[PDB]
Amino acid sequence: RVLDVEVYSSRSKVYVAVDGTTVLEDEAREQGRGIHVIVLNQATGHVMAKRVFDTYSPHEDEAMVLFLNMVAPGRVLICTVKDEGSFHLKDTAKALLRSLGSQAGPALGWRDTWAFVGRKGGPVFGEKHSKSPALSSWGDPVLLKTDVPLSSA
Ligand SMILES: O=[N+]([O-])c1ccc(O[C@@H]2O[C@H](CO)[C@@H](O)[C@H](O)[C@@H]2O)cc1
């Protein structure tokens, strides 16, 4: 079958809904900055892992690379940015995002918004990105809605 996946990225709020049900929601004012990553089972849509990496801060990108490298091929990966995710998103992490098929991830800039849904090992199912227009501003909120094919037993 399919999963209906909805992913939202903005300055102050992220959420992810799967089949109309909210599995992640973070609207807290000064918490949860960075790249939120959700891993779903590719047959059932069950949440395997939920992490946030504050890649505005040093060393979090290194943690994210270790984490993503251990995700099994075939898992569904969902990424979404809250506030800022680029400042300490360094070349190794960007290369990894590129390997996953992301076009916007490797190009992520200051206060850009970004939502991504893909299968580890490819293909990418959907991706949206809004560039911040100025250093004192954030990218526009992005709402990505995409259908994800499920694998069958
Ligand atoms: O002049 N500067 O280098 C500079 C000026 C203002 C800045 O604001 C910060 O930006 C972070 C990323 O958006 C927010 O998480 C944080 O809460 C705060 O708003 C950061 C840097």
Numbering used by the authors: 97 to 249
Q: What's in the article?
A:
Here, selenomethionine derivatization and mercury soaking have been investigated for SFX experiments using the high-energy XFEL at the SPring-8 Angstrom Compact Free-Electron Laser (SACLA), Hyogo, Japan. Three successful cases are reported of single-wavelength anomalous diffraction (SAD) phasing using X-rays of less than 1 Å wavelength with reasonable numbers of diffraction patterns (13 000, 60 000 and 11 000). We succeeded in experimental phasing using SeMet-derivatization and Hg-soaking techniques at wavelengths of 0.954 and 0.984 Å, respectively. Such high-energy X-rays, which are essential for Se-SAD, allowed us to collect data at high resolution (1.4–1.6 Å) and perform SAD phasing with 11 000–60 000 indexed patterns.
SeMet-labeled Stem (the stem domain of human POMGnT1) crystallizes in the space group P21212. Diffraction data from SeMet-Stem were collected at a wavelength of 0.954 Å (13.0 keV). There are two monomers in the asymmetric unit and each polypeptide consists of 164 amino acid residues, of which three methionine residues were replaced with SeMet (Bijvoet ratio ≃ 3.7%). Out of 91 437 collected images, 35 295 (38.6%) were selected using the Cheetah pipeline adapted for SACLA. Of these images, 26 583 (75.3%) patterns were indexed and integrated using the CrystFEL suite, with sensor geometry refined by geoptimiser. At least 13 000 patterns (a mean multiplicity of 74.3 at 1.4 Å resolution) were required for SAD phase determination. The localization of Se sites required 13 000 patterns. From 13 000 patterns, we identified the positions of three Se atoms in the asymmetric unit using SHELXD as CCall of 9.21% and CCweak of 5.42%. When the correct hand was used in SHELXE, a mean FOM of 0.649 was obtained, and 285 residues were modeled with CC = 42.5%. The electron-density map for the correct hand was readily interpretable.
